[PDB]
């Protein structure tokens, strides 16, 4: 089974830094 | 431009996360408030969106590398079909924070598939 573009983004990115982002993101939504 | 370009890839992250998250969220039988879930399906969809924009902006670096290797067995759209494959590898494992352009890192991912496709029909 090939890696799938998750498996790929977890090799390089750690759940803390996804956080932050995801977060970077809410924001710009809600600005407005 | 190499700027819209990590945005892009920011873009593409965090549609990723906001997809696993919402998968496991749903794993362990919890679900989000509706405010949030809408929020999260948004950076889903905006996630796509920008993975088929990358995709979309890098096409044509495709073509101009499948026209070095035109009339040698393979056919153009055939040269064409694998660089794209070889195209969206590279977007799947392009790492923005590195600082190198993706155009630039997604140039080798576009020849390898091409040129293994080449030597394997034959």
Redesign the interface.
Known sequence: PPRT??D??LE??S?EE??E??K???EL??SR | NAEEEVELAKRIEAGLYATQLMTELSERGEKLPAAQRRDMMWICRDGDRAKNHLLEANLRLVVSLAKRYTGRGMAFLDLIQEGNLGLIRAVEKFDYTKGYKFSTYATWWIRQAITRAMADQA
Request: no cysteine; glycine share 0%.
């Open positions: 573009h998750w790929m983004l390089r990115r759940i996804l956080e982002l995801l970077e993101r809410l939504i809600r």
